[PDB]
Design a binder for these strands. Structure first.
Lengths: 292, 1114, 88, 49, 49, 93
RNA sequence: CCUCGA
DNA sequence: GTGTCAGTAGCTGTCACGGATGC
DNA sequence: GCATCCGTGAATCGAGGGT
């Protein structure tokens, strides 16, 4: 195990001296921002306190060296600079964490990447996206398997730029700028125009938890009144979605390739079978089997 | 009759057991705790008749522990006494409006005793604004009603634990002596058969090190613990010996880095455990130790401190338990069993309520001032010092503000409906300071404990991550001055039930055996059967002779919570659906008009009255003048009280709290009678929903698995219509380039949008405002150096910007109220604000597709379709049903209560008449005579675990009253023949038909619908915001990205993570490409990934992107 | 008082560039219908932010020539925008 | 281990007071461990992924 | 190392990455998802792309 | 399109090669003027201007000065986007 | 982080 | 400029598992 | 050479409210 570490410094050509630092970098300010409160006071990032406490002790060291302070103070100060820099990189790693106001351990640079709130899992493996929505789901027996019903007010905001384009083409609005004021004010012209836009434009429905890939399927949206999403009764098994207050999210594919991926790969009619067992899922399941 | 005490409607109960004790004040948990804290005359008289000797209020106990204050010499002394309150600063409703705190000024009497001059100056010192409790048990912090929740904490005392080792597979044992304050001390036996002790989390010292520090010789130690080889081996394996040697060993491990003096360690080792300064077991902590060890079992609780005798007897108790002993008597003490404690038993799990929780925060504030006092004493002169000069009340007011402002126990009050508020004031929370962390709660703290009987409800508990950590206080339960929860029981003398009622704690209850409430009892009191169901110690249930029963339960519903006692036919619903049934009643929405349920439980009256959202007359009298605005009562003596109705008030959760008078002009009203009822109330009963004509049948798939179909009659007649009110707010501040001004004059805004505004820019009362409409016109001046080149050219080719208050997306209603605060007009705003406007918008929400309805049995569902009144399957006489519930989602959940409720509901709607001729039939022999006949729309009671039996229910269906035409519509089975309104052909088979109480839950699509094209983005990560209120987008999480990869939709995945999210240039070119009709451009690099590289660099890691050639690219 | 890492503090947000992108698209259309002289003068005064004498020095024209071209080109753009219904 | 005393009643008949209470021990732990059984499941899934 | 640092033991992985001076061949589903490239699977493979 | 992502130990020379200046003073900002203090954790000479093309001393507030190092305040004039990418550093004694 | 919904 | 005693709160009511750390 | 003790991990999305 020692060779595993030593041979790494041998071949690569980097010196082991890098594990000892002579200078520490300062993270850009927008990544450690200081925000103002509605009461006039200020709230800052923990890193500014951590960086600030390192600077205070580093500036004190320059005083002690210049002043020729006793070797006990210079040595006992360097340790504090070591413990302070140890907190900047990974507070709490050694010993007791640097407590903030309220005996709360301050976040360190390494805490920015760990676990569900770290940069990797929270902001890289999953972002949060534009052109999306969510609402209550309601069963729609009349719907075909490839159909879903989204509320008019949901589709309007999702297709807002598409509606603005067509409102300005058909000369309902003078310019694209005024086309936006028409949708924001919900002028009656958009509801007839919106149908041309959403025509055969599939959308994706998602219900968490997304356990398997059949947790997301593509549908052809159908403008419905009301504010709930209308779901086909046969896809309830795949989503494992009952109707006692469940919510689903809607995502609008934009690019031509994205529409093709939803139309062919993710359309609900092309995913009748369970990928795990090969037995059907979109089949008569509850009331339907009793009737038969 | 049911609830014949205040003058309520006559609700008839199917009760077979009499109620010996009527329900106490359901709000007493908050009241008695706060009255004890301030020593109100009501609390003192309560402790007076309780038998108490020298009771102490909450303030008096903190002041006595503090008095007196002396320096190191003792020449100067300060003391406090007699705390009193002046009248309240501002009334309750005025505080909510002006965003201040409900408080009363606190006065104490302090005097300065000077030892070197022999003269004392005593005077009155104002201590601070003291937050006061409303009559409803709530506090008002900065205009928001809050509720201080009772906390379950580990009781002080001595506790023993038997742990099992992992590697050596031997039984280990440990002891903890948990004080009410100070340092901790835990002994343990490691796997080497040696005994040690950890002092305040510190290193584990041998148990003899403590004995040597106290002055005990090594021989006398062998004299006491010689019977065990594990203690003999401890003194042998010991490192240092000597009284002055182990005493320094403790000092350098307890306070390292300091010079060890023989008297600097002798001082703290006496102060940390035997001086009342830094250690104290409360009067309950001393009593809990005196039983476990069996010492001072007769002494009055006067020693508030640990003694060396306790430590020795404690170590003797531990060492015997390790080697199998089961009995021990302390030298000079009574015999006591040797066992381990539960720490979950409600005798070792203590409940501290508002007064105790506040006392600790006052105690911290006083101690912070005490240290300032001792320093200010030795600084000022010893003759011009007054109590005003020694007292700095800054840390005191900052301590109660810190608590109510920031505390896991000061919780935003639940105010959906009165039941939701009442339950919140009776909550028992295990989380919080001094308790435990949520990550520190195993599957054992959460499950039901046998000691919860009659104390904490085993049903009402959240099902989320807080399951088991939050309970509701049982109905008859109460809290003793010690902190434990008492519940009443009926003392059985000699196989005879007595009306003598005594409250027993958890451990007090185990020392006896109690019979179940529904035991057959003679009219004199003797049990009918020799064998009766009896609960025994350690949660053991078994039959036992009638001559063994010592006590028995007061009422059948003794074990449930207030909300649970409101579930009819509760004995037929599983705990799972019952939990949801009780948890969803607290989510009920106040309807426009309220109807009391036909099928009730009897709790509906006291739950509504004790909630405090109705108007009860304090003293008897007659109604002199009654208006929709106020009610004036002329008493018999001659005085007048006028009660003002709360009309269209915004609740904490947007529901409508609206009180309406019930009595009329010149109506004789007794004391304690409901003269006006508020939301979810009818004649004084909780009306959380409506009585709906239900049919249990599948209908064309619209009700498929738990969806609900409703008749449009509920829309046309506002049967399920509810009022919701939103508060909108904006302020005018001082900016860097001037000051924001609120004006009707807004740049580049038409006169048509501004047509509804007054001359100030404020919407006028009564205007209907859609989303996006302007409510308050505010413009802020923007500097020239902040202008876009196009914005500057557009400004050149043609200094304030628009910051008007607009209506958020999804809001709509009538503007009902405006409140304006101006610094110019004496209005005290935060520094930097000149004017503040709040606009109240009220919406009338009819029932819509997707709104969530539910019953009392966890039977929930959304509205899938609202058919017209003619499409609904209608009964034989033409009356169409109101709601259709799918049958498949009924027998799985095991919630038969809805079936029994549906049947009884119909019998209540139609009425019945039992054949009295030829005697009383054999099934109704147990029914009271008041039930043999019932008129239509009769009110009935099915008490929990009592009430209607299935045999009696079957008989009522046989004698259901006929309709107005003389026809009986439902069969004895309870089903009826329905006609399909769409085709006309009658349905082939009879269908269960009846009336069920359905509540409209606070989960409406009008609030939960959301959609976003673009909007705000987080500055750091450049990803879209979250939440509907911020106009955010949905989160394509990790599992959802696996779904795209599973589909192989690579381009969709890149689109999601690039142009649709954090591509700074890619998202804009998509927006441009859409309005141009061009194709979607190529996605760029996520700005969030750029941040990642810059974060790895900040950790001294050199990350670089290399091209195909090998050159690093920037 | 506050720490951004600590809960209870609102995160900073920046609005979307939709309104700015639409104006930029309409300005780019009205700009294309201008002479090469007028277009090359408004793009040096508003897009580059130079002074009147700086544009006169670059283009090798008189001082008042830049003032006159800017004076018309602005009105020429106002003609094209009002013809397309751009709000004043 | 199973209780040496059973729940004799049926939900149609009506549980006794103690019967309902003794039922909740397993019912609540039925919900409690179900949240834990789903947590270890979802963690195993992301390791397999 | 980017696919591993995003799984478990982030600090323990990034340390070994800097000692070994590891280079990440950006050719993987988890890696390309992070930076925003097309995943090498489904419609992202070179045959169909 | 970039193939490899290399990671390694940051030499003290790399730490200085990244940093646009050393953070000497411990101050943050001014609590009256909202101006970041010079050589502080928000120094505009090091990290960048608070507002676009606006320097600290106020001499250059216009776009015409693209790339000018102000002589009285030492602040560059680019967009405030650089305050998201310019690193600082502390030289340890 | 308090409460809550699938 | 400073000068007699002048001394945290809080807290352990999580656990399985592996391997470097340490007697 | 081995017991201890250190550090790592512990489901997804969503609403509203305080400091």
């Amino acid at each position: 195990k020692r060779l595993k570490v030593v041979a790494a410094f041998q071949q690569s050509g980097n010196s082991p001296m890098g594990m000892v630092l002579d200078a520490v970098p300062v993270i850009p300010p927008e990544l450690r921002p200081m925000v103002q409160l509605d009461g006039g006071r200020f709230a800052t990032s923990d890193l500014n306190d951590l960086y600030r406490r390192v600077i205070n002790r580093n500036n004190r060291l320059k005083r002690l060296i210049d002043l020729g302070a006793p070797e006990i103070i210079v040595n006992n100060e360097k340790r504090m600079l070591q413990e302070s820099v140890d907190a900047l990189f990974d507070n709490g790693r050694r010993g007791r964490p640097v407590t903030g106001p309220g005996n709360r351990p301050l976040k360190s640079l390494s805490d920015l990447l760990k676990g569900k709130q770290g940069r990797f899992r929270q902001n890289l493996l999953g972002k949060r996206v534009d052109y999306s929505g969510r609402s209550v789901i309601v069963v729609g027996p009349q719907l075909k398997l490839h159909q879903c019903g989204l509320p008019k007010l949901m589709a309007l905001e999702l297709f807002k730029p598409f509606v603005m384009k067509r409102l300005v083409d058909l000369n309902h609005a003078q310019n694209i700028k005024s086309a936006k004021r028409m949708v924001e004010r919900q002028r009656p012209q958009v509801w007839d125009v919106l149908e041309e836009v959403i025509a055969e434009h599939p959308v994706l429905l998602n219900r968490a938890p997304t356990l398997h890939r059949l947790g997301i399927q593509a549908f052809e949206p159908m403008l419905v009144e009301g504010k709930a999403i209308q779901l086909h009764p046969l896809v309830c098994e795949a989503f494992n979605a009952d109707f006692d207050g469940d919510q689903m999210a809607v995502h609008l594919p934009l690019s031509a390739e994205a529409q093709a991926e939803a139309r062919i790969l993710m359309l609900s009619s092309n995913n009748i079978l369970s990928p795990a067992s090969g037995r059907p899922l979109a089949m008569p399941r509850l009331d339907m089997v009793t009737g038969l | 009759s049911n609830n014949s005490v205040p003058g309520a409607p006559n609700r008839v109960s199917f009760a077979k057991l009499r109620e010996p004790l009527e329900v106490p004040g359901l709000l007493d948990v908050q009241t008695d705790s706060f009255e004890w804290l301030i020593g109100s005359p009501r609390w003192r008289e309560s402790a007076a008749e309780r038998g108490d000797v020298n009771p102490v209020g909450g303030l008096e106990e903190v002041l006595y522990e503090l008095s007196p204050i002396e320096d190191f010499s003792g020449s100067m002394s300060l003391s406090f006494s007699d705390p009193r309150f002046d009248d309240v600063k501002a009334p309750v409703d005025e505080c909510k409006d002006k965003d201040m705190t409900y408080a009363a000024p606190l006065f104490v009497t302090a005097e300065f005793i000077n030892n070197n001059t022999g003269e004392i100056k005593s005077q009155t010192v104002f201590m601070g604004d003291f937050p006061m409790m409303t009559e409803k048990g709530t506090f008002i912090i900065n205009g928001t009603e809050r509720v201080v929740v009772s906390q379950l904490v580990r009781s002080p005392g001595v506790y023993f634990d038997e742990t099992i080792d992992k590697s050596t597979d031997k039984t280990l044992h440990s002891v903890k002596v948990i004080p009410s304050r100070g340092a901790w001390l835990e002994f343990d036996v490691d796997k080497r058969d040696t005994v040690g002790v950890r002092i305040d989390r510190k290193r584990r010292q041998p148990v003899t090190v403590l004995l040597k520090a106290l002055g005990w010789t090594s021989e006398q130690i062998v004299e006491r613990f010689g019977f065990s080889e594990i203690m003999r081996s401890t003194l042998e394996k010991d490192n240092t010996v000597g009284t002055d040697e182990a005493l320094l060993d403790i000092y350098r491990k307890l306070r390292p880095g300091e010079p060890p003096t023989k008297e600097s360690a002798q001082t703290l080792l006496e102060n940390l455990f035997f001086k009342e300064k830094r250690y104290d077991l409360a009067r309950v902590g001393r009593y809990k130790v005196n039983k476990k060890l069996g010492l001072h079992v007769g002494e009055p609780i006067t020693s508030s401190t640990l003694t060396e005798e306790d430590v020795v007897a404690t170590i003797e108790y531990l060492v015997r338990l390790h080697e199998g002993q089961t009995t021990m008597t302390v030298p000079g003490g009574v015999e006591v069993p040797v066992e381990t404690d539960d720490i979950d038993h409600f005798g070792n799990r203590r409940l501290r309520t508002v007064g105790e929780l506040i006392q600790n925060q006052i105690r911290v504030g006083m101690s912070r001032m005490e240290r300032v006092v001792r320093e200010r004493m030795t600084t000022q002169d010893v003759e011009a010092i007054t109590p005003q000069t020694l007292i700095n009340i800054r840390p005191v007011v900052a301590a109660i503000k810190e608590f109510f402002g920031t505390s896991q126990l000061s919780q935003f009050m639940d105010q959906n409906n009165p039941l939701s508020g009442l339950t919140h004031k009776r909550r028992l929370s295990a989380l919080g300071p001094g308790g435990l962390s949520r990550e520190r709660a195993g599957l054992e703290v959460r499950d039901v404990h046998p000691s919860h009987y009659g104390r904490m409800c085993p049903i009402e508990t959240p099902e989320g991550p807080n399951i088991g950590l939050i309970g509701s206080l049982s109905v008859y339960a109460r809290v003793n001055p010690f902190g434990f929860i008492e519940t009443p029981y009926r003392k059985v003398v000699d196989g005879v039930v007595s009306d003598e009622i005594v409250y027993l704690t958890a451990d007090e209850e185990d020392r006896h055996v109690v019979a179940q409430a529904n035991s057959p009892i003679d009219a004199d009191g003797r049990f009918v059967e020799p064998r009766v169901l009896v609960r025994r110690k350690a949660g053991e249930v078994e039959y036992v002779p009638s001559s063994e029963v010592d006590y028995m339960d007061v009422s059948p519903r003794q074990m449930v919570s207030v909300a649970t006692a409101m579930i009819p036919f509760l004995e037929h619903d599983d705990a799972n659906r019952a939990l949801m049934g009780a948890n969803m009643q607290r989510q009920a929405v106040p309807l426009v008009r309220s109807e009391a349920p036909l099928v009730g439980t009897g709790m509906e009256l006291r739950a509504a009255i004790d909630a405090g959202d109705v108007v009860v007359a304090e003293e008897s009298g007659v109604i002199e003048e009654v208006s929709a605005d106020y009610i004036t009562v002329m008493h018999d003596n001659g005085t007048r009280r006028t009660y003002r109705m709360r009309k269209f008030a915004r609740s904490n959760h947007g529901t409508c709290a609206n009180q309406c008078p019930i009595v009329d002009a010149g109506d004789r009203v007794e004391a304690g009678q409901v003269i006006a009822d508020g939301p979810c109330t009818d004649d004084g009963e909780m009306a959380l929903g409506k009585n709906l004509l239900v049919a249990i049948m599948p209908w064309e798939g619209h009700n498929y698995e738990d969806a609900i179909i409703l008749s449009n009659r509920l829309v046309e007649e506002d049967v399920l219509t509810s009022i919701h009110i939103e508060e909108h707010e904006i302020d005018a501040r001082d900016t860097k380039l001037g000051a924001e001004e609120i004006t009707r004059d807004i740049p580049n805004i038409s006169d048509e949008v501004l047509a509804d505004l007054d001359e100030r820019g404020i919407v006028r009362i009564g205007a209907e405002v859609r989303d996006g409409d302007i409510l308050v016109g505010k413009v802020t001046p923007k500097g020239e150096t902040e202008l876009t080149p196009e914005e500057r050219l557009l400004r050149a080719i043609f200094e304030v910007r628009d910051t008007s208050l607009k209506v958020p997306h999804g809001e709509s209603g009538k503007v009902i109220g405006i409140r304006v605060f101006s610094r110019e007009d004496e209005d005290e705003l935060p520094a930097g604000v000149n004017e503040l406007v709040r606009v109240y918008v009220a919406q009338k929400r009819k029932i819509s597709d997707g709104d969530k309805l539910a019953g009392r049995h966890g039977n929930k569902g959304v509205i899938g379709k609202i058919l017209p009144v003619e499409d609904m399957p209608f009964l034989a006489d033409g009356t169409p049903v109101d709601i259709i519930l799918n049958t498949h989602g009924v027998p799985r959940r095991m919630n038969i209560g809805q079936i029994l409720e549906t049947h009884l509901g119909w019998c209540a709607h139609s009425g019945w008449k039992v054949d009295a001729a030829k005697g009383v039939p054999d099934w109704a022999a147990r029914l009271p005579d008041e039930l043999l006949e019932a008129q239509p729309n009769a009110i009935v009671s099915t008490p929990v675990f009592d009430g209607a039996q299935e045999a009696e229910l079957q008989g009522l269906l046989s004698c259901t009253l006929p309709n107005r035409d003389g026809d009986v519509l439902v069969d004895a089975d309870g089903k009826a023949m329905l006609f399909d309104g769409r085709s006309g052909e009658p349905f082939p088979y009879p269908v269960t038909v009846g009336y069920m109480y359905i509540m409209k839950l606070h989960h409406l699509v009008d609030d939960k619908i959301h959609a976003r094209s673009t909007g705000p983005y987080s500055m750091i990560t450049q990803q879209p915001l979250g939440g509907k209120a911020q106009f955010g987008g949905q989160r394509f999480g990790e599992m959802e990205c696996w779904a795209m990869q599973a589909y192989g939709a690579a381009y969709t995945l890149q689109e999601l993570l690039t142009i649709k999210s954090d591509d700074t240039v890619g998202r804009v070119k998509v927006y441009e490409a859409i309005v141009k009709g061009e194709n979607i451009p190529e996605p760029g690099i996520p700005e969030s990934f750029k941040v990642l590289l810059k974060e790895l660099q900040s950790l001294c890691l050199n990350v670089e992107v290399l091209s195909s050639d090998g050159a690093a690219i920037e | 008082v506050g720490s951004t890492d600590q809960s209870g503090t609102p995160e900073q947000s920046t609005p979307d560039e939709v309104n700015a992108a639409l104006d930029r698209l309409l300005i780019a259309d009205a700009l294309a219908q201008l002479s090469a002289e007028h277009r090359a003068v408004i793009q040096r005064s508003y897009y580059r932010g130079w002074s009147t004498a700086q544009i006169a020095t670059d283009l090798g024209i008189a001082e008042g020539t830049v003032k006159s071209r800017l004076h018309y080109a602005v009105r020429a753009l106002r003609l094209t925008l009002q013809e397309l219904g751009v709000t004043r | 281990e199973f209780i040496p005393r059973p729940v004799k009643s049926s939900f149609r008949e009506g549980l006794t007071v103690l019967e309902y209470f003794i039922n909740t021990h397993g019912a609540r732990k039925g919900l409690a461990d179900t949240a834990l059984r789903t947590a270890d499941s979802g963690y195993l899934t992301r390791r397999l992924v | 190392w980017l696919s591993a640092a995003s799984f478990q033991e982030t600090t323990r992985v990034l340390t070994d990455a800097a000692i070994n001076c590891r280079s990440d061949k950006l050719n993987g589903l988890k890696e390309n998802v992070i930076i925003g490239k097309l995943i090498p699977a489904g419609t992202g493979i070179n045959r169909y792309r | 399109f970039f193939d490899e992502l290399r990671i390694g130990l940051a030499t003290a020379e790399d730490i200085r090669q990244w940093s646009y200046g050393e953070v000497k003073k411990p101050e943050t900002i001014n609590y009256r003027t909202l101006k970041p203090e010079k050589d502080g954790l928000f120094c505009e000479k090091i990290f960048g201007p608070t507002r676009d093309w606006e320097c600290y001393c106020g001499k250059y507030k216009r776009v015409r000065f693209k790339g000018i190092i102000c002589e009285r305040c030492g602040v560059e004039v680019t967009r405030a986007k650089v305050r998201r990418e310019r690193m600082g550093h502390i030289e340890l004694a």
